[PDB]
Amino acid sequence: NPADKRRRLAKQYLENLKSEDEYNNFDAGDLDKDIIASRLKEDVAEQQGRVFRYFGDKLLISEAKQSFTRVGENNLTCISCFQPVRLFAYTVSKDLQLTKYDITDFSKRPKKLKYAKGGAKYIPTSKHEYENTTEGHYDEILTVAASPDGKYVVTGGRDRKLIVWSTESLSPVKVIPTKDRRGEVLSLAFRKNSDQLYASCADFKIRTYSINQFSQLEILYGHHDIVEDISALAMERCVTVGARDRTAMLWKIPDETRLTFRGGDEPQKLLRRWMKEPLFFCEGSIDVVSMVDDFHFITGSDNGNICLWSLAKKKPIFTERIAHGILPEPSFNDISGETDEELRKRQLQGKKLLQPFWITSLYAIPYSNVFISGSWSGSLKVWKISDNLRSFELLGELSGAKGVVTKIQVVESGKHGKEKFRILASIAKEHRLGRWIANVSGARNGIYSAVIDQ
Amino acid sequence: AAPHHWLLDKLSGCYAPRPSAGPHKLRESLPLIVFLRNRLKYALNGREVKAILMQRHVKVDGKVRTDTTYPAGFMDVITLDATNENFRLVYDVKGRFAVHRITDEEASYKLGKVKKVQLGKKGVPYVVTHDGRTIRYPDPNIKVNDTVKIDLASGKITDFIKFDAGKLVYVTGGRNLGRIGTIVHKERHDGGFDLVHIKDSLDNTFVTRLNNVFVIGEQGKPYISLPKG
Amino acid sequence: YSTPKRPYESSRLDAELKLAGEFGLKNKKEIYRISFQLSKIRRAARDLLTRDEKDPKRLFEGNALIRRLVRVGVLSEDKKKLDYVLALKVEDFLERRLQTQVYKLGLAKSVHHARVLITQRHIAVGKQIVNIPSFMVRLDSEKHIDFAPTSPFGGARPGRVARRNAARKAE
Amino acid sequence: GKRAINYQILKNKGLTPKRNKDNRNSRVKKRKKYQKAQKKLKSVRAVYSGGQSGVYEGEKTGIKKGLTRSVKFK
Amino acid sequence: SQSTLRASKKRLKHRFWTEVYQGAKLFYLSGVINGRYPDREILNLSRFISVMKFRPLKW
Amino acid sequence: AVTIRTRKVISNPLLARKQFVVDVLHPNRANVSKDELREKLAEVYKAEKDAVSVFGFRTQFGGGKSVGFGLVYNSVAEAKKFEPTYRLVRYGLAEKVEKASR
RNA sequence: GGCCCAUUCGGGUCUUGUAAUUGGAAUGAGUACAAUGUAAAUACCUUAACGAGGAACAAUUGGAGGGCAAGUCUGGUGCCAG
RNA sequence: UUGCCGUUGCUAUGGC
């Protein structure tokens, strides 16, 4: 048995490498490095923070105050929020408008404050990739990001620019182009409690910036498709996911190194695993992330998977195969064009062309026990991760959001044992990158806010 | 050109620092330059470790002793004034100098193996140790290889640990150098391989010499604190 | 490298003619170098076939050899057998160099345009500008071959000929 | 007043034949002897050029009804 | 440019070697210091003159 | 615009000093510009501009980053005491020439 | 009109040539600001300015074959052979 | 509660 001989010889090999618990167990170099550890400074940014907010089953779920404030902007795309240590929120749309909200009036719907709308006036007079230093967006703003301190919001989209606006007036303070032709930005994330931005640009590139210095730190390379989502916490690590290469990478940005995590679910072995006694299959494209803590994260796929990954395992720890359902099959009055229902039913091939909803938004509350998933099934899902950190489980649903969920994130309130949050979710009737979405089933372009309690 | 005990990285230089003469031997000590500069790294080069030696931060065995190649051997408590650094350095299990950090009431003393008791001149009993502290007047029952406890403010013996069957012993020398556990066996031969034998995690057995072993306390209660992992 | 056995037979001359013309090579030393180390590779894989199944050398060095050949990129992911290392040959190795790859990705119009782009530093894989044409890109650096951002074919400031013509036409 | 040396005393290329600009580069010579070779290959074989370009105009060069350019067995 | 010093050094040596036998001595004098040349360089120049092993000519 | 990143900041009370490694970031600039770097370091930390010092600069290939070794003092007088004389000649105020003979 | 085969007659094939004109891009050797490095200096690394049309900013070495004069030499059965 | 437009509430919904 050749793989048995491989495992056996590898075991003998590791035993021989060990060859080349007592009462005294102290090692001189380890305790010397621990003396240097006692000598050093800056136990602030580099907390390898584990899950210290265990509250998944604690708070209420089923009776949230859900207000779906519809807004008149075609296809809202992103949502950025802010809390100091009054709270503002930000939305941005495919109609080239950024909009500031106040959200701190917690028991009611948010309040519009200020527009900032680019348009055809901001097309540059050059068509030349480094004099892209205009003051507004002329194409398809895809992402906003508020500063952790709140001086600025920074936004960008398919016009390959980063425009950083002031908070108090929504004015463009600085323009930083991405200096090449395909340099469309797709996701932005500040590292927490900082002034450092991580943008993920479709050149298979990740750009980093210091916003209050108007400088770019480091460009870091290495995905294989467009870097569709990004996520960061207080550590200088980052977690990006490229779309169709089906890998999620995490980046030690000062070292400029990474850990890659591929997928790897196969319907052959999965249907055999069920065949030991079923509509589930392989993977299209890993789409969204959120780093839950500094040892784990969660990925949202294109076949409706939500997966939970550790920092110490290439293959994922936990899967959840169907997370928002399978799409309604196309009707017999809109598949075939024959006359009889028998042939128009034969043109469905049974179950072979039922496609699942793909999770287009995922948000893990940082270091907490609970994350929120959203797609165009109409109902957001709330999941909590078990305390042994090897599984998660569906708590409840938030069914007042008709449309695609282009963004989810939460806003905190309450103290250490009694808490209430408003879950913002940007709702559109069209995916945040291309159109591709038919059967617009009662959708509206709005902000689904929910107020969850206890 | 280095020994094994110093935990000295090879990418350092060409000439290795010979320790000067002092209390301990050359083969069982580390100087202050290899202590401060390239082990716990309070310096970067010989110039600035000489600078802090001229500033006189070091207080090994309660005296200053400003010297670069001063041979700190076994359990000389290195004392540094800034950030109240108290360091008792002992042997680890694989031959190096593990420098444990201790506190002030433990660095207020040390212990020492007695080597010989003499009727030297004028009726004065007499005792020496590995740093050579010729202190006056112990009890008559000081055999060889017992353990005195030095005062470190004056020089007097304060406590005494008798060497017998059933004592916690430290081995510094030969192929057992730096082991603790002190009980499987006792065997005093008549000129070599004579010792008390030391256990392991599975309570294995070991052979050493008398002079290459010296007592540190009792079965569970040494008043020295020890590092762990 | 090392010269072949019969270096002047007409099949070898037409071989080197087709190789140097189809891949834009400068002399025979490119073919001879890459073929010398390919000879070492499949001379090793021949011995790995001449030993038997469940041999430790065969198991470990065989999957090691085919995995680092797949990661160089001359061998595809699905053929994980050791006889494909014998079926491997020299243009499978010099299709992997950066001049060939720049032309195939279409940043250049021919292999000679690719060679002069590379030697004039308009091409950077990943982070670093590569400037020698025989580079042997890998399967992960295959998709980050793009124009350098320090170059006018990227988005940078235009070169001396363009700016001197602009200045003289401004005069 | 400095009688500087000139190029024929400096480089000392005494009495050479006329040589080739294509020989002054080893790469361009193999670019232009491969273009010559693959223009000669159209003479010996018939080279697949890429299929039908536009409308089928005709054979453009002639059709021989007497010649059969096919390999007979044994 | 010590680089161009070394480059022109080599080029002069080779062009001198095509005019005299291949392996004649080209000597390098540095800048003049106090009216005349450095005496180290003139010392080993005289060391080169002192061993020359003349061969008899015809005229 | 240059950018600054300190890493692995330890304190040396024996030398009255705080030392760290310096990732200096200059996209589309030449290099570190060490006096301007001492200015930027002396303003990100506290004032002591004749007590902040950097010495070990290595720029990686293609530019952008350079790793240096940063050590910052309190008390400019004890910085003059503890720093070596060649770095004092390079940056600060000291200048003693060696006697040129033999 | 080029090319290919063949001892011969001949055969096979096809956009191929030209010191023809011409166009704007590219940059590298070189010349050089620096800063970095280093006891100091060199070098590596980073890098503004200039730097191509005979791109004369002028790579070789060896081989195969011609052709020409109011020219010269030799032979001898005109005008030829060498 | 918005680009319009409808039911509107004296606030929620649904068609482009």
CA distance, residue B99 to nearest chain F CA (Å): 18
> How many other β-carbons are positioned within 10 Å of the β-carbon of residue F12?
21
Distance C164 CA to G30 C1' (A): 19
Across the A:F interface, residue pairs with CB atoms under 8 Å apart total 32
SS3 A312: coil
How does DSSP classify residue B220?
A: S
Q: Give the count of alpha carbons within 13 A of E19, CB side only.
A: 12
> How many other β-carbons are positioned within 10 Å of the β-carbon of residue A346?
14
Sign of CA dihedral D26, D28, D29, D35: positive
Kind of pairing between the strands at A446-452 and A65-70: antiparallel
Structural Rg of chain B based on CA atoms: 18
Sign of CA dihedral A117, A120, A126, A129: positive
Instruction: Please state the φ and ψ torsions of residue B195, each to the nearest 5 degrees.
Output: -175, 180
Tokens of F64: 């952008």
How far, CA to CA in Å, does C26 sit from each of C91, C115, D27, E30?
Answer: 15, 10, 4, 43
Tokens of A39: 């000598």
SS3 A249: strand
Instruction: Please state the φ and ψ torsions of residue A314, each to the nearest 5 degrees.
Output: -65, -60
Cα–Cα nearest to D35, from D54, D53, D22: D22
* C contact test, residue of A4, A5, A218, A223 with most C CBs within 10 A: A5
How far, CA to CA in Å, does A19 sit from each of A12, A14, A16, A211, C56?
Answer: 10, 9, 5, 53, 21
CA distance A202 to A140: 14
Q: Please report where in the chains the tokens 């680089």 appear, as a residue.
A: E3
CA distance, residue F28 to nearest chain C CA (Å): 9
* A contact test, residue of B9, B34, B41 with most A CBs within 10 A: B41
Residue of F nearest to A215 (CA): F1
Residue of A nearest to C142 (CA): A224
Burial of A116 (0-12, 13-18, 19+ CB in 10 A): buried
> How many other β-carbons are positioned within 10 Å of the β-carbon of residue A401?
27
Q: At what angle do helices C56-72 and A2-19 cross, to 10 degrees?
A: 90
CB-CB contact of A319 with A390 (8 Å): no
> Does B64 contact chain F (CB < 8 Å)?
no
CB-CB contact of A10 with C63 (8 Å): no
CA distance A278 to A270: 10
CA distance B99 to B79: 12
Query: Residue-wise over B147-157: b if at least 16 C-beta within 10 A, else e?
Result: bbbbbbeeeeb
CB-CB contact of A418 with A58 (8 Å): no
Cα–Cα nearest to C126, from F61, E9, B163: F61
Of chain F, the end-to-end C-alpha distance in Å amounts to 49
Three-state SS letters, C83-114: CHHHHCCHHHHCCCCHHHHHHHHCCCCCHHHH
| D 10-69, residues with C-beta < 7 Å of strand G | 11, 13, 16-17, 19-21, 23-26, 36, 39-40, 42-44, 46, 49, 60-62, 64, 67, 69
Across the A:B interface, residue pairs with CB atoms under 8 Å apart total 54
User: Chain C residues with CB inside 8 Å of A219's CB?
Assistant: 127
User: Which nucleotide is closest, CA of C131 to its C1'?
Assistant: G28
- The region that residue B7 occupies, defined by phi over 0 for left and psi between -120 and 50 for alpha, beta otherwise, is left
CA distance B225 to B227: 7
Q: Give the count of alpha carbons within 13 A of A230, CB side only.
A: 28
Q: Please report where in the chains the tokens 């960008």 appear, as a residue.
A: A156
Contacts of E among chains (3+ CB pairs under 8 A): D
Across the A:C interface, residue pairs with CB atoms under 8 Å apart total 39
- The region that residue A197 occupies, defined by phi over 0 for left and psi between -120 and 50 for alpha, beta otherwise, is beta
How far, CA to CA in Å, does A129 sit from each of A122, A155, A159?
Answer: 14, 19, 11
CB-CB contact of A233 with A293 (8 Å): yes
Q: Please report where in the chains the tokens 């050949």 appear, as a residue.
A: C69
**In this structure, is the CB of residue C121 within 7 Å of any atom belonging to strand G?**
yes
Return the C-alpha torsion angle A239, A241, A242, A244, nearest 10: 150
CB contact under 8 A, B99 and A22: no
Burial of A143 (0-12, 13-18, 19+ CB in 10 A): buried
* Cα A303 from chain centre: 16
Residues in chain E: 59
Distance C165 CA to G52 C1' (A): 14
* Cα A256 from chain centre: 21
User: Chain E residues with CB inside 8 Å of D12's CB?
Assistant: 15, 18
CB-CB contact of A103 with A81 (8 Å): yes
- Give, for C36, the enclosing helix (H) or strand (E): helix C28-50
Q: Please report where in the chains the tokens 């503002």 appear, as a residue.
A: A88
User: Chain E residues with CB inside 8 Å of D10's CB?
Assistant: 15
Distance F50 CA to G37 C1' (A): 22
CB contact under 8 A, A129 and C59: no
CA distance D41 to D32: 14
User: Chain F residues with CB inside 8 Å of B78's CB?
Assistant: none
User: Chain A residues with CB inside 8 Å of B96's CB?
Assistant: 28-29
Distance F58 CA to G46 C1' (A): 10
Tell me whether residue C71 is in a domain.
Answer: yes
For chains D and B, having 3+ Cβ pairs within 8 Å is answered no
CB-CB contact of B87 with A39 (8 Å): no
CB contact under 8 A, A39 and F18: no
CA distance A147 to B175: 62
CB-CB contact of A454 with A406 (8 Å): no
Number of domains in chain F: 1
Kind of pairing between the strands at B85-91 and A88-93: unpaired
CA distance B20 to B2: 15
> Does C109 contact chain D (CB < 8 Å)?
no
> Does E15 contact chain D (CB < 8 Å)?
yes
For residue A290, what are the contacts with CB-CB under 8 A and spacing of at least 6? Answer: A231, A297, A298, A362, A363, A364, A371
CATH T-level topology, domain B163-229: SH3 type barrels. (2.30.30)
In angstroms, what is the resolution?
A: 4.1
Q: Which amino acid is at D61?
A: T
CATH numeric code, B110-160: 2.40.50.740
- The region that residue A159 occupies, defined by phi over 0 for left and psi between -120 and 50 for alpha, beta otherwise, is alpha
How does DSSP classify residue C22?
A: H
Instruction: Please state the φ and ψ torsions of residue B78, each to the nearest 5 degrees.
Output: -70, 125
CA distance, residue A221 to nearest chain C CA (Å): 6
CATH H-level superfamily of B1-105? RNA-binding S4 domain (3.10.290.10)
Three-state SS letters, chain B: CCCCCCCCCCCCCCCCCCCCCCCCCHHHCECHHHHHCCCCCCCCCHHHHHHHHHHCCECHHHCCCCCCCCCECCCCCEEECHHHEEEEEEECCCCCEEEEECCHHHHCCEEEECCCECCCCCCCCEECCCCCCCEECCCCCCCCCCEEEECCCCCCEEEEECCCCCCEEEECCHHHCCEECCCCEEECCCCCCCEEECCCCCCCCCCCCCCCEEEEECCCCCCCCCCCC
For chains E and F, having 3+ Cβ pairs within 8 Å is answered no
CA distance F70 to F48: 13
Nearest residue to G52, CA vs C1'? Answer: C161
CA distance C84 to B7: 50
CATH number at residue F45: 3.30.70.3370
For residue B166, what are the contacts with CB-CB under 8 A and spacing of at least 6? Answer: B183, B219
For residue A414, what are the contacts with CB-CB under 8 A and spacing of at least 6? Answer: A420
CA distance, residue A226 to nearest chain C CA (Å): 11
For residue F90, what are the contacts with CB-CB under 8 A and spacing of at least 6? Answer: none
The residue segments making up the domain with residue F69 are 3-102
- Residue A220's DSSP bridge partners are A206
Cα–Cα nearest to B141, from B151, B154, B127: B127
The residue segments making up the domain with residue C162 are 7-171
Tokens of A188: 């932005």
CA distance C134 to F76: 55
CB contact under 8 A, C112 and D31: yes
Scanning F13-52 for CB atoms below 8 A from B yields 13-15
Number of domains in chain C: 1
CA distance, residue E40 to nearest chain D CA (Å): 30
Tokens of A289: 């992330």
For residue A114, what are the contacts with CB-CB under 8 A and spacing of at least 6? Answer: A99, A100, A169, A170
SS3 A72: coil
Q: Please report where in the chains the tokens 């590791």 appear, as a residue.
A: A14
> Does C128 contact chain F (CB < 8 Å)?
yes
For residue B15, what are the contacts with CB-CB under 8 A and spacing of at least 6? Answer: B1
Q: Which amino acid is at C120?
A: Q
> How many other β-carbons are positioned within 10 Å of the β-carbon of residue B179?
23
Contacts of B among chains (3+ CB pairs under 8 A): A, F
Q: At what angle do helices C111-119 and C98-105 cross, to 10 degrees?
A: 120
> How many other β-carbons are positioned within 10 Å of the β-carbon of residue A448?
24
Tokens of A167: 């908070």
Cα–Cα nearest to F52, from F35, F31, F67: F35
CB-CB contact of B213 with B171 (8 Å): yes
- Residue C147's DSSP bridge partners are C123
For residue E2, what are the contacts with CB-CB under 8 A and spacing of at least 6? Answer: none
How does DSSP classify residue A213?
A: T
Tokens of B93: 């299990």
Residue of A nearest to F28 (CA): A216
Query: Residue-wise over E26-48: b if at least 16 C-beta within 10 A, else e?
Result: eeeeeeeeeeeeeeeeeeebeee
Cα–Cα nearest to B157, from B131, B132, B140, B136: B136
User: Chain F residues with CB inside 8 Å of A216's CB?
Assistant: 3, 27
CA distance A200 to A185: 6
CA distance B103 to B86: 6
Structural Rg of chain F based on CA atoms: 15
Nearest residue to G54, CA vs C1'? Answer: D21
> Does C164 contact chain D (CB < 8 Å)?
no
**In this structure, is the CB of residue F69 within 7 Å of any atom belonging to strand G?**
no
Nearest to C144 among A130, A179, A221 (CB): A221
CB contact under 8 A, A36 and B41: yes
CA distance A93 to A407: 12
